[PDB]
Design an enzyme around this catalytic site. Structure first.
Site, PDB file in Angstrom:
ATOM      1  N   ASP D  13      40.950  41.919  39.803  1.00 25.00           N
ATOM      2  CA  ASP D  13      41.608  41.171  40.944  1.00 25.00           C
ATOM      3  C   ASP D  13      40.585  40.493  41.827  1.00 25.00           C
ATOM      4  O   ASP D  13      39.523  40.892  41.665  1.00 25.00           O
ATOM      5  CB  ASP D  13      42.675  41.909  41.893  1.00 25.00           C
ATOM      6  CG  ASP D  13      43.836  42.476  41.070  1.00 25.00           C
ATOM      7  OD1 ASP D  13      44.543  41.883  40.264  1.00 25.00           O
ATOM      8  OD2 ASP D  13      44.131  43.631  41.305  1.00 25.00           O
ATOM      9  N   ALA D  14      41.160  39.788  42.607  1.00 28.94           N
ATOM     10  CA  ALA D  14      40.213  39.192  43.582  1.00 28.94           C
ATOM     11  C   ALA D  14      39.690  40.400  44.691  1.00 28.94           C
ATOM     12  O   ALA D  14      38.534  40.144  45.192  1.00 28.94           O
ATOM     13  CB  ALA D  14      41.155  38.006  44.444  1.00 28.94           C
TER      14      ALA D  14
END
Lengths: 113, 123, 126, 97
Positions: D13-14
């Site tokens: 994910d970010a």
């Protein structure tokens, strides 16, 4: 909070149903809109250094979800969220996720919940 | 030609009973990962070095589908190595049959020249 | 020139802080889905008519990234329409800026064969 | 019983870690190779995340049969990164034709 969504084709598998891992994605979507509606979107939060982390999650599957099905995720209230997935008013799944903040701190935010 | 071996996971298929087209790009990413690792300079190492590989464009032709539990190979080939970009071509084989072919073009950001040591492992 | 509106979801991003390139094709699929639906022939209905839309190839040019929660639009157009294939072009706009360009080529399959695009699907496309 | 795997970039994910929804996908792969070693329906699933997994971290998934009955089996899961258990989980299944 009521979150509305339609099943996309790539969210299904060869079994012709939504892959169970995707439900946790629907739940995450519900949380995102819940916070946004509260004026505390998960977005402006991170700006402050607050990053919601997941501790645990559970989901019970009662009924299948097919491509293009329209359904809603009913979200409700360390803090945990309860989730109920309805398709034509029938409970197709129930879940819950546990989260916390790290800037690991107390819940500042607190009442937008 | 660098060979990458892989088997189709169930969550990678869709209702049509075949691997979703978008997952092929993920297969190509995995191929690129092992390729760079086999050279002794994996992409993760590049990243902890401040280097970033940016995807410029991607293409894929689908001839025959892939099904759950299918064993297949991704044959990666370095197509072009220029000063600022590099291109990979891929061929997906199942039981020695070309079921899809593709290619991706990348540049690097630190937009910078492809560093010497990376150039060395891309050759 | 059909417009499809969507916001970036967190799980669609990777460690580089941007939407993973593979998800763009998923965005285009959603856009095709609303296009066909808005016209009266939602894909689901086609699948019930025994029609299957098979992808031949797809291309995507990445100009600028999409970040978590970015509001963006996918504008899709019909590039070509022959008796067996049809091609869609797409432009991903963010704040009226072209962030990505792409195209996909499809054909229609019924039973286990490529059949001439039926007049039913034909009217909707052009 | 023992499933070895490495974290792919697209699985993160970010926030720079493997998205929690992906863990269930790893449990499915492990579960898959376990059976091969020797219509299934998922009833429920749970996962506890203690430590995050990063891009291309090598990790191990310890699979174990925990419960068994005439109508449903349950697998337990433990994910190891080095000598540290970063995630605990389980899933129950049944079968319908």
């Amino acid at each position: 909070f009521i979150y509305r969504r339609r099943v996309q084709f790539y969210e299904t598998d060869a079994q012709g149903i939504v892959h169970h891992s995707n439900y946790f994605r629907y739940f995450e979507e519900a949380r995102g809109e819940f916070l946004r509606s509260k004026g505390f979107p998960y977005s402006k939060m991170r700006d402050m250094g607050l990053e919601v982390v997941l501790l645990n999650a559970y989901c019970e599957y009662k009924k299948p979800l097919f491509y293009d099905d329209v359904f809603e995720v009913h979200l409700n209230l360390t803090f945990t969220f309860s989730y109920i997935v309805f398709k034509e008013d029938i409970a197709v799944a129930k879940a819950n996720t546990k989260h916390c903040m790290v800037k690991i701190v107390s819940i500042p935010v607190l009442e937008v919940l």
